[PDB]
Amino acid sequence: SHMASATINLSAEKQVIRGFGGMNHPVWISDLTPQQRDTAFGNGEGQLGFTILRIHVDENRNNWSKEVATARRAIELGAIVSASPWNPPSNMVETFTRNGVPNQKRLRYDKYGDYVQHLNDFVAYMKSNGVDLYAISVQNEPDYAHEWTWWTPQEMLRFMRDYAGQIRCRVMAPESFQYLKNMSDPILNDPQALANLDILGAHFYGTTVNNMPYPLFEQKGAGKELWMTEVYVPNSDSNSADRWPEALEVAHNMHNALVEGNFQAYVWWYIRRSYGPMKEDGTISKRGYMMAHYSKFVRPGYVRVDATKNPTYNVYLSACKNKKDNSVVAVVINKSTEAKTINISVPGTSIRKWERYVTTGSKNLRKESDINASGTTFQVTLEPQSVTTFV
Ligand SMILES: N[C@@H](Cc1c[nH]c[nH+]1)C(=O)O
């Protein structure tokens, strides 16, 4: 009557979750402190439970040592590390005019081999320092490189087809600023380039929900991972990270990445920033608690399953299964100003009790009363303007 229904189908397995996290950049900003590394990558009370660290590949190898402390610590705490370059070493770059704008940067065509060696050198250096990179990217935002190095779709294709097989690591590409398919379609449509791809990386700046599905990747991307490797939402406004109900957009963007995009990873920009998941004082922001609803509970290796995604207006549901014991983690967002009651059917489960943690404008991951199932149905109530994780 006033009650919507949802079904979680534990037998309809979607993508395996790789993880959640954010960026460290100890050259552009201050490195994470030891305390901040634990807060980010630990999963104790008051910690974010991140499992992915993104770092940059500096054009100047003399900066590489600055990455090590944080990356080692992340790995020790159970995270994986991916690395993205913004520019090649300046001796490999040339200028050109793009769309009438002069003095734009690209990798010299005669330096693609030397660029592979630069990337391989970084991989080797980090490995020598106890940082076995999960992946390394060809280029950060090759299609939004006003302030860095541009690659056209065909330049990226040439590198992926003719060079990237020499990289001694998983290769990530193309990290389009907005997941523009023109950057990635040529890779997926060329068998050698596709063979040399390991992770399709994408950013989400201005990416609408209708542009989150990718039919070509569904068709040709078997064995390749799909990662959303950078965003901040809904803005990078100074001191915005505790704004409420604005922060609910973070949860909604993550729900969309997972359910509308089938993404296996979701990685914020700077971990510690006034608009990020960790505030400058080292404590978790409202935006951070939005991330934590997923990161603390949907651990690497869980598998997303089919679940009614939008059971009623302003309510969004995702579900992931732990294949070790077929338990489920459900993250449910209520953006409504009204409370919502959902009958969530989980056919075939032997689970009969969920614990729940709730964030609103006035509390953070507050543990609330357990939900006891009637048979295989869990009736939940969602406070106005809230996110709840059921576990
Ligand atoms: N986060 C990007 C900047 C950006 C905003 N929008 C697109 N790109 C960077 O710092 O490299």
Q: What is the CATH number of the domain that holds 364?
A: 2.60.40.1180
Residue 84 shares a structural domain with residue 121:
yes
Residue 60 shares a structural domain with residue 107:
yes
Kindly name the residue from 59, 175, 230, 260 that is annotated as catalytic: 230
Residue 60 shares a structural domain with residue 112:
yes
Give me ligand 1 centre to Cα 142, in Å. 11
Residue 133 shares a structural domain with residue 269:
yes
Q: If DSSP codes are grouped into helix, strand and coil, which group holds residue 251? A: helix
Q: Is cis: bond before 174, omega within 30 of 0?
A: yes
Question: What was the structure determination method?
Answer: X-ray
- Single-letter code of the amino acid located at 158: R
Give me ligand 1 centre to Cα 172, in Å. 18
Q: If DSSP codes are grouped into helix, strand and coil, which group holds residue 12? A: strand
CATH number of the domain bearing residue 269: 3.20.20.80
Boundary-marking domain end, from 261, 283, 300: 300
Whether residue 352 contacts residue 310, with contact meaning beta carbons closer than 8 Å, is answered with no
Structure-token pair, residue 8: 């979680």
> Which H or E run includes 9?
strand 3-16
Residue 285 shares a structural domain with residue 346:
no
Boundary-marking domain end, from 270, 300, 330: 300
Q: Using the Cα atoms of residue 83, residue 269, residue 308 and residue 216 in order, give the sign of their dihedral.
A: negative
Resolution (A): 1.5
The structure tokens 């979607």 sit at 14
Say if residue 314 is exposed, middle or buried (CB neighbours under 10 Å; 0-12, 13-18, 19+): middle
Kindly name the residue from 67, 141, 260, 383 that is annotated as catalytic: 141
Give the chain's domain count: 2
- Single-letter code of the amino acid located at 231: V
CA dist., res. 206 & res. 133, Å (int)? 29
Structure-token pair, residue 126: 């980090």
Whether residue 342 contacts residue 6, with contact meaning beta carbons closer than 8 Å, is answered with yes
Give me ligand 1 centre to Cα 231, in Å. 8
Which neighbouring-strand residues pair with 202?
176, 228
First to last CA, the chain: 27
Structure-token pair, residue 12: 């309809």
Residue 118 shares a structural domain with residue 6:
no
Domain span holding position 216: 18-300
The structure tokens 């630990």 sit at 42
DSSP character at residue 188: H
CA dist., res. 298 & res. 187, Å (int)? 30
Helix axes 153-162, 112-128, angle to 10 degrees: 60
